[PDB]
Amino acid sequence: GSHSMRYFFTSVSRPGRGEPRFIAVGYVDDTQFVRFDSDAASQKMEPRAPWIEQEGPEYWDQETRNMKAHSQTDRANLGTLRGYYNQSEDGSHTIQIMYGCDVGPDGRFLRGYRQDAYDGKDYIALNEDLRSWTAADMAAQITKRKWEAVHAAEQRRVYLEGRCVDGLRRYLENGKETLQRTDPPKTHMTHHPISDHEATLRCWALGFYPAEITLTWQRDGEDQTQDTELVETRPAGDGTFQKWAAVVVPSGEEQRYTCHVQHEGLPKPLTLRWP
Amino acid sequence: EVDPIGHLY
Amino acid sequence: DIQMTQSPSTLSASVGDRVTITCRASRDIGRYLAWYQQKPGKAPKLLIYLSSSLESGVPSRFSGSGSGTEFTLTISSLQPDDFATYYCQQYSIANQLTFGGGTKVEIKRTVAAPSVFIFPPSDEQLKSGTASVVCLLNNFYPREAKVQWKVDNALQSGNSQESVTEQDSKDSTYSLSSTLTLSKADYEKHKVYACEVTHQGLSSPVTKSFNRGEC
Amino acid sequence: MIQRTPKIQVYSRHPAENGKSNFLNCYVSGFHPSDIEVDLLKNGERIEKVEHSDLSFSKDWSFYLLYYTEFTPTEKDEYACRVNHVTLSQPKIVKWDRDM
Amino acid sequence: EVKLVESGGGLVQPGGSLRLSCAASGSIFSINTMGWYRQTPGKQRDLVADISSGGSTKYGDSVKGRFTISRDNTKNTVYLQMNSLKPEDTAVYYCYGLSYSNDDYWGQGTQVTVS
Amino acid sequence: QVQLVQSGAEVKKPGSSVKVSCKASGGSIADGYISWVRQAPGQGLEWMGGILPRVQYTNYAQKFQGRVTITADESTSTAYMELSSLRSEDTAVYYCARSPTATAAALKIWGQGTMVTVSSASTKGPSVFPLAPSSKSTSGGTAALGCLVKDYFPEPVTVSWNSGALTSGVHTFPAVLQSSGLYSLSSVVTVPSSSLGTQTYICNVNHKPSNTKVDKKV
Structure with missing residues (x-):
């Protein structure tokens, strides 16, 4: 199956003289393997997966230097945007950057992306062709004009089609025994009464990797999403995930409802019915 | 790995 | 630091020749290499960025290739204006720049006794x-x-x-x-x-x- | 400036059995800005040894965090997660319901 | 069921001192952790100082060293000693308590004004 | 288009410090990353460090760590480079370069360079001696004569023959640094042997730092 490597960056400014809080994480699929935190004592990029510790001091030094560079760039951009918006120096503002690449089963590049945000709103993103920018507001349009002048799209395209894919392939090779594992969910159904005439059926999916799953309810074969409650997938804490879906059903009609679980680790989609 | 090029606004 | 090795340190060629200059890094720098041209008494002029992309105004005879540890600068048809010294620079780490030794391209002619x-x-x-x-x-x-x-x-x-x-x-x-x-x-x-x-x-x-x- | 209220889930890593080691998880997601205060409570007090994951965010730029601690579930013991945020007039407490 | 009674607010010059007190009703085994939250302008109350039944205390980052919280274990009353007060401490302070089943009870709140 | 203009050449004694400016015209010094590169005479390029002027965040090479202070001033659009504890090995042309990025990358815009001569010698005028033609300097109907410009400081001296009248066949060699801290060079010109007895050759040596102009006849 396809694989993805993603990096997530966050820089939050502080009203006091303290430097902005910068934290970065790296993901291969849904597995974290690196972190950088400015409030950490070490002030170095730290391993978060067993398979990334095979890397060398050269790797860790390069990553730490690049993290510090990114932190200072975000520090500059926070001030630039604050000056643009004439915002008070006593406020706290956030810059978020996410970028990465996708590769296929053969390991060749599929797609790459890069998106920037300021205070939770879209600021500037790289188009699918990796050759243009989409601006969400006028400050973004200023940045877009400058970047179209100075080759930012080409630099990002080079990184994504090069180094991102190479790193993803190397990380997959080094940690296949965990990164190339599909864990099917352990599924069971629970019955929670509400009233004498009403009840709730809840379909569970526990301990599955990767996080992409589809829990759906059907009444006598007809898909219905009117009384369906679906929580967002949550991490179990050990690399696996959990999810559940609920339907409010009348009492005595439990046998009419079925739960369908589609996951890439399952050979064929399941069908659970309440006994 | 991490992109070593940073851009300004 | 990533050490860049250039070869040769000196190259003699005639007008109309194909000139190849090789730059080698001590470790994988990816595509993050830049080529420069410098003439005596003048500042370096950026020719190629990202190891293959020509700068605006650079003639099309210049071409760069290579990713990883081996790189190459090629001048397809050498012109009189192309006789200078060429440096390769790596920028694979955001705050670390290293240049190569430099290659001087001189005009080749027949042997003359002093x-x-x-x-x-x-x-x-x-x-x-x-x-x-x-x-x-x-x-x-x-x-x-x-x-x-x-x-x-x-x-x-x-x-x-x-x-x-x-x-x-x-x-x-x-x-x-x-x-x-x-x-x-x-x-x-x-x-x-x-x-x-x-x-x-x-x-x-x-x-x-x-x-x-x-x- | 967009401010999003947190979503709080309190759950265990494994289905709870009284007397066997487990992990108590408090999943706080979909909130902006990042500054949040999350506490795990046991019988009215605050559990001192609580670890949390590194700050990250979803496609819609909303942050999520996982605050977890190691515990041995027993009956008569009550667990809950308290989350304080800029968008809350007072801190919100979500209790550990077993089948949730 | 459980009512919290607050006292000790008022007006005080910078560098002064005030002592807040919060008393809980019911049996002694009804409340575990008692503390104080203070209002921030942005519809949010931040922690000041809380203490459990066993004396496990915690303080906010802005009141470390300056404020002290103590508990009269014979009853369900806690006291907060505020020293080296600053103009930035002017806020409404809310008492709160957590039951052994994690039910939070809040008081009306008392004003502490530092000129 | 952004242009970087640097300060003039500095002659410094060992142990002193030199501050080199770099003014950005047509733009701001804060719209990019200013790098500082030096090049010893006849040697390759060497990266010293840089600064992100918008946050005043600087980086230095390990070789120059503890000696170079790179600062930028956005009010005047100038980036400075101060190198302390100067020694003879610091004699180089120092360049400021700009990248249109937050981090140092392919340097596109460069300054003209500043020459820092770290020498203990004092400003001294040249001594121009003649290199007389003779039978040993005549080969195939051509005779070689010239002037030896010796013991001057600092660079440069401009040598011209007959006030620019004789430019064909003139070889002014680069000046070499002697063991005494001073310089020396020779300017030789080849002329026909039949013109020795009828043409007068005078070498014009001009040294601006010492305000010395010497016209010696060979």
């Missing part, structure tokens, strides 16, 4: 308290020339300095001057001062000498 002239020190400098003997190697190619000083058939070591001109703009030759610095007492101690010049263009070494005090 004309060796030797000048005795002037009377004015003898009055001033020092003696300087100048040997001239004029209008020769290639650059590799060996000059040795013989004082009464005794070799001298550590009392001479050589200066070479850049290639001339008409005949693309070189010129060299070796100056022998001696104290006046040491100059008057001996009698025969000779300059022996060994070059590819000479069938046998050429020694031009003068006798002290004879007009």
